[PDB]
Design a protein around this ligand. Structure first.
Ligand SMILES: [Zn+2]
Ligand SMILES: [Zn+2]
Ligand SMILES: [Zn+2]
Lengths: 78, 206, 130, 332, 183, 66, 59, 89
RNA sequence: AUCGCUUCUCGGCCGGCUAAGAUCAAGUGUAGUAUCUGUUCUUAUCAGUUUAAUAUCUGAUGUCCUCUCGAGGAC
């Protein structure tokens, strides 16, 4: 479970408000939030690696309460 | 009547409030320096005065933001607002008003047999003036042994916010050319200067 | 901003600034901010570049006189006995610089060190109470 | 916040006292040293009421204090042993009612140190050379000669340096118009540091050494050494040449010993005890200080115990050879 | 033994990996825990020579103290052909800044960090001083809550986080003002 | 530095460092009239006997080395 | 690692962030882990709070 | 190759030539001349009378210490007459 | 309506001629540091030096016998 997939975001969000955002729950050890080079903008889906698995299963339970730019945030195991 | 001030023999002051219902002893603050403490005194609720076995006088004030109810080796501390070396060990500290109709002041004896006082400034004018006094006096009238004044009062801890009166009073003993020329560097007159130092003594003490 | 290092010359020159400032302001009661700056000064202690190490030396000497030895020594304690050779070389160099001057005023600030079998490491004179 | 400091009552504690003629008068002005304070008193031949002519604060820790005189001179200066690295020679101008700084010399660092001089202070009876010393490793000498105008000029320093050597006390020695001598109590701890057993803690006697200044060779060489039987705290000048023998008295635990060179053998006497004493027998005795009474007729000494017992110390001499010593109970 | 050596100290946590190799651990144990003394910097055992330019390339060049900003010098300082430069010598114009000596006798008087318990090390900037219970402004704006952050409503149901066990967040076991809703 | 007593180095032992600070403390005691007087007050002796016991403790303190 | 510690009964904190073997941290955790209410006979100055409350229920 | 002699400081006044004239010896600076230089006649003698403390020319003035070296008390060490690590002449 | 061609319209990517006109700026040395580039260790094990620990450096490849590195026997 150490990693999660996160959908439905707005590009003003970046890797930092994800950092800050999910460490509110529990620390994101490895952050991945693609920067698209071609048009220089984000599609808004994320992958998160944690310290171990327990962090991330609690993360499955609590985790999908985040709302990025008035809008819904997908978090599921991976 | 509210809090309690612990004085360590080594690590100095420990602020301790007694919670009445839980009956617990609560250390919410401590000193930033080790100091060998003879005795303590309260200038006010938020300040503490203390003397060193080595004959130093420190004053440490709480920050106004202190947390009154709580639960390296500490959490929050108190800045040290004054350090002055008397050169003579002080066994008691008492705040009082020496003379009737006088201004409230601080009192320290010493082990040498001397009795002296610390006094607050009510104005920045006398402040800066006495500052220039100390300044031009030092180099223009060095201490007798050749030892420097500043270091001697900064001896264990660097001086913070203290003007030495016993140096300022030596204005009397200097030669008239010293007295005058310095007064010119001060842009005053020997009577002006002299009486103006008589001011603090008179008003506060004998 | 400068002492936080873009490139060594920043740390060096800025450190020299801390030095001359530190001699200049002495005795006037500004020590606090000089302590804050001493924080950022402190990591630069380690390097082999002659100009930056001698610079840092001058720096910590001026900071010695301005701040007073007590705070210095409180940064220099743990480094004395640390296992590594490097750290001991340096912190002992510093501690010597602090030691030669103001050796008279250091007395109060040596902490309490417990006594072992063959030796009594507690100085009991300071614990005589009237 | 800011605090202005005032003294009100100046300290009455007197650490040192030196008696000399500072006005060029037949009267004797008494320069005493309060803790941080230099002080000058005038007792009165008739009524004895002690007049305070001057009180001055030096803003520095006084360490030792001695008065001296140029040879056959009219007047007396002051030597201030201080906590700074500077010896200063002072003169009290009778008119101006205050001291002047006659000489300022810088021999080393600041504050009470282990190796930095100013601690112990001695001077020659003829006032030729003053010797200053620390507790350890550094013993310096300044030579004094009046100028062409007979005003005092100080020479360049010298060095007695002896490694790892503790100095209990230093006392001027009397040799009339000679190469000056100095009595330095010493001890070596280098035996004690290298002896893991702890034997050198015991079985190590403090070495009495006489240094000889030499004007012509203009250096200070170690000359005389004897091991002291038991540890004495301080020494006493014995005026030599014309008046009396030239030697030194040594105040030691439960003893006093005149111990001198030439062929002069040591003379020991026990420190007398009072009949039926209530103190712990395990508590011994030494002498605190001594004030020599020197007269054109005779001379003697004054000693005191912990208990306050002042004795008059006398010398029984055959020509320049002292055969024995006589101590009579004086007062308390 | 590094094991039993940890029983002799009030704060044995101070003992570390290489600490057991010390020439005198039986002391250093007692020093390193001294009351107000500060730890040794950590950049050694890292072979990187104390810095790299990774995080240092995203920093601003500099920003002035507000006391110097209100003055107005910032706009005065801001380009020139070579012959205009030799004209600037032949022509020359005076008084481009034209500062107000009243203002620069004012600001630094009329108008005009860290404590001892801190020391800087290589990579540390923001983090320690975004934590469970502490967030930035804007992300509050995206969240859009007027002055708990609402998923600490679900930190009620599902339980305190495994990742930060020591946690307290307002209103639950932590009995809150401004931004910071948990400590 | 070497000829300046009290100089430390990387190989400095505990025992030597603490006996140093001891001896320096004792020179301070000999130095300051007051603190000395404090000692005389507390444990009852003469100023003299105090300084004498100290001068005895100069070489020893902590006792034998290791 | 913290699961082994905490489920082992050794709480997870820095204190233990050194030693590996299961045994030693058990004694370390053992290393990790009284008032006087004055009875009326003047002998209860040794008597505990709860004990004197029990003698309140008895009295 | 070039280092202090550090013999005991005497009463002899320091002497600097044209070149070195303004320099405070140790800090290498021209700022705030305050106190005065002292070196031993062992370092200053004879052909060294009124000699430069540095280059070996005739002294036209006297060196003054800065205030910087004053507070750090360096002026109290051994005589700061530089000796080349050959002889002094 | 679709395919192809064409016309128009719109949107998105989206410095003259002459002899070429003529002419053309570099201090040194003593110490010292930094930053670029290129190239080298899959070595196995043990012993010693060494290191905070590594690293590094330094030495050899179970023993005996028989036969032609291999085989057998005794440990
Ligand atoms: Zn010399
Ligand atoms: Zn020159
Ligand atoms: Zn200088």
């Amino acid at each position: 479970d150490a990693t999660v997939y996160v959908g439905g975001l707005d590009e003003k969000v970046s890797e930092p408000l994800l950092w800050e955002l999910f460490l509110q729950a529990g620390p994101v050890v490895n952050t991945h939030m693609p920067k698209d080079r071609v048009t220089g903008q984000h599609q808004g889906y994320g992958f998160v690696e944690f310290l171990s698995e327990e962090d991330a299963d609690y993360a499955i339970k609590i985790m999908n309460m985040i709302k990025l730019y008035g809008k819904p945030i997908r978090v599921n195991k991976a | 009547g509210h809090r309690v001030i612990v004085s360590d023999v080594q690590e100095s002051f420990i602020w301790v409030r007694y919670k009445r219902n839980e009956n617990q002893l609560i250390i919410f603050a401590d000193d930033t320096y080790p100091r060998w403490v003879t005795t303590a005194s309260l200038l006010d609720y938020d300040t503490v005065a203390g003397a060193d076995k080595f004959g130093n006088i420190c004053v440490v004030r709480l920050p106004p933001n202190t947390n009154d109810e709580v639960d390296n080796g500490a959490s929050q501390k108190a800045e040290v607002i004054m350090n002055y070396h008397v050169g003579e060990t002080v066994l008691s500290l008492q705040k009082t008003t020496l003379i009737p109709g006088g201004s409230e002041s601080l009192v320290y004896t010493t082990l040498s047999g001397g009795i002296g006082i610390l006094v607050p400034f009510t104005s920045h004018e006398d402040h800066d003036f006495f500052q220039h006094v100390e300044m031009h006096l030092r180099s223009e009238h060095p201490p007798l042994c050749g030892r420097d004044h500043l270091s001697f009062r900064s001896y264990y801890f660097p001086v913070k916010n203290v003007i030495d009166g016993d140096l300022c009073e030596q204005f009397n003993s200097m030669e008239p050319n010293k007295q005058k020329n310095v007064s010119e560097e001060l842009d005053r007159t020997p009577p002006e200067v002299s009486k103006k130092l008589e001011d603090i003594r008179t008003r506060y003490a004998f | 901003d400068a002492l936080m290092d873009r490139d060594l010359v920043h740390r060096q020159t800025a450190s020299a600034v801390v030095q001359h400032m530190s001699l200049g302001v002495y005795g006037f009661g500004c020590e606090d901010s000089l302590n804050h700056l001493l924080n950022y000064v402190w990591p630069n202690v380690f390097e082999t570049s002659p100009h930056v190490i001698q610079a840092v030396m001058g720096a910590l000497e001026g900071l010695r006189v301005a701040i007073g030895p007590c705070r210095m020594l409180q940064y220099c304690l743990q480094g004395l006995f640390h296992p590594a050779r490097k750290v001991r070389d340096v912190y002992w160099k510093i501690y010597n610089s602090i030691y030669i001057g103001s050796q008279d005023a250091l007395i109060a600030h040596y902490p309490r060190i417990y006594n072992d079998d063959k030796n009594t490491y507690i100085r009991y004179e300071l614990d005589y109470i009237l | 916040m800011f605090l202005y400091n005032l003294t009100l009552q100046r300290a009455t504690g007197i650490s040192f006292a030196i008696h000399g003629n500072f006005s060029g008068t037949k009267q004797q002005e008494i320069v005493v040293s309060r803790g941080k304070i230099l002080e000058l008193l005038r007792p009165d031949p008739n009524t004895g009421k002690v007049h305070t002519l001057l009180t001055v604060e030096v803003f520095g820790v006084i360490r030792s204090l001695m008065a001296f005189r140029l040879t056959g001179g009219t007047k007396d200066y002051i030597v201030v042993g201080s906590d700074s690295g500077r010896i200063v020679i002072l003169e009290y101008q009778p008119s101006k009612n205050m001291f002047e700084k006659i000489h300022q010399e810088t021999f080393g660092k600041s504050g009470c140190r282990r190796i930095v001089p100013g601690q112990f202070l001695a001077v020659d009876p003829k006032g030729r050379a003053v010797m200053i010393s620390a507790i350890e490793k550094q013993k310096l000498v300044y030579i004094l000669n009046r100028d062409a105008a007979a005003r005092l000029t100080i020479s360049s320093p010298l060095e007695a340096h002896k490694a790892n050597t503790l100095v209990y006390h230093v006392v001027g020695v009397d040799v009339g118009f000679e190469n000056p001598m100095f009595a330095c109590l010493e001890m070596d701890y280098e035996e004690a540091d290298n002896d893991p057993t702890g034997e050198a803690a015991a079985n190590t006697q403090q070495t009495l050494t006489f240094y000889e200044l030499d004007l012509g060779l203009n250096h200070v060489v170690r000359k005389y050494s004897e091991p002291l039987e038991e540890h004495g705290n301080f020494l006493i000048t014995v005026p030599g040449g014309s008046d009396g023998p030239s030697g030194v008295l040594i105040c030691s635990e439960n003893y006093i010993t005149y111990k001198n060179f030439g062929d002069q053998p040591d003379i020991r006497c026990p420190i007398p005890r009072r009949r039926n004493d209530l103190d712990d027998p395990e508590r011994g005795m030494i002498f605190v200080c001594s004030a020599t009474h020197k007269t054109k007729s005779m001379f003697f000494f004054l000693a005191q115990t912990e208990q306050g017992d002042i004795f008059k110390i006398t010398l029984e001499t055959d020509e320049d050879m002292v055969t024995e010593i006589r101590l009579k109970y004086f007062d308390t | 033994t590094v094991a039993e050596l940890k029983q002799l100290v009030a704060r044995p946590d101070v003992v570390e990996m290489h600490d057991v190799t010390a020439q005198d651990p039986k002391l250093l144990v007692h020093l390193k825990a001294t009351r107000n003394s500060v730890p040794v910097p950590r950049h050694w055992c890292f072979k990187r020579k104390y810095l790299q330019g990774k995080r240092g390339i995203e920093k601003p060049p500099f920003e002035l103290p507000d006391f110097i900003k209100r003055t107005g010098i910032q706009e005065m300082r801001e380009q020139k052909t070579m012959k205009s430069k030799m004209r600037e010598k032949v022509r020359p114009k005076m008084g481009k800044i034209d500062i107000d000596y009243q203002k620069l006798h004012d600001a630094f008087f009329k108008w005009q960090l860290t404590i001892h318990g801190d020391l800087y090390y290589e990579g540390k900037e923001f983090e320690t001083r975004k934590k469970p219970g502490d967030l930035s402004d804007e992300l509050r704006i995206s969240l859009g809550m007027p002055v708990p952050p609402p998923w600490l409503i679900a930190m009620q149901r599902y339980g305190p986080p495994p990742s930060y066990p020591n946690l307290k967040i307002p209103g639950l076991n932590s009995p809150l003002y401004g931004d910071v809703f948990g400590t | 530095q070497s000829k300046y007593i009290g100089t430390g180095h990387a190989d400095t032992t505990k025992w030597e460092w603490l006996v140093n600070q001891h001896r320096d403390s004792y020179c301070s005691y000999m130095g300051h009239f007051d603190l000395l007087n404090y000692f005389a007050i507390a444990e009852n002796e003469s100023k003299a006997r105090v300084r004498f016991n100290l001068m005895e403790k100069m070489l020893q303190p902590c006792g034998p080395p290791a | 690692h913290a699961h082994g510690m905490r489920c082992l009964g050794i709480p997870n904190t820095a204190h233990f962030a050194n030693v590996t073997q299961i045994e030693d941290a058990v004694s370390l955790w053992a290393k990790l882990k009284d008032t006087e209410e004055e009875y009326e006979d003047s002998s209860g100055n040794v008597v505990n709070k709860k004990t004197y409350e029990d003698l309140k229920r008895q009295g | 190759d070039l280092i202090f002699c550090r013999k005991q400081a005497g009463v002899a006044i320091g002497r600097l030539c044209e070149k070195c004239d303004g320099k405070c010896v140790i800090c290498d600076s021209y700022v705030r001349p305050c106190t005065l230089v002292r070196i031993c006649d062992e370092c200053n003698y004879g052909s060294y009378q009124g000699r430069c403390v540095i280059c070996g020319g005739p002294g036209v003035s006297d060196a003054y210490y800065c205030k910087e070296c004053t507070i750090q008390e360096k002026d109290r060490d051994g005589c700061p007459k530089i000796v080349n690590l050959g002889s002094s002449k």
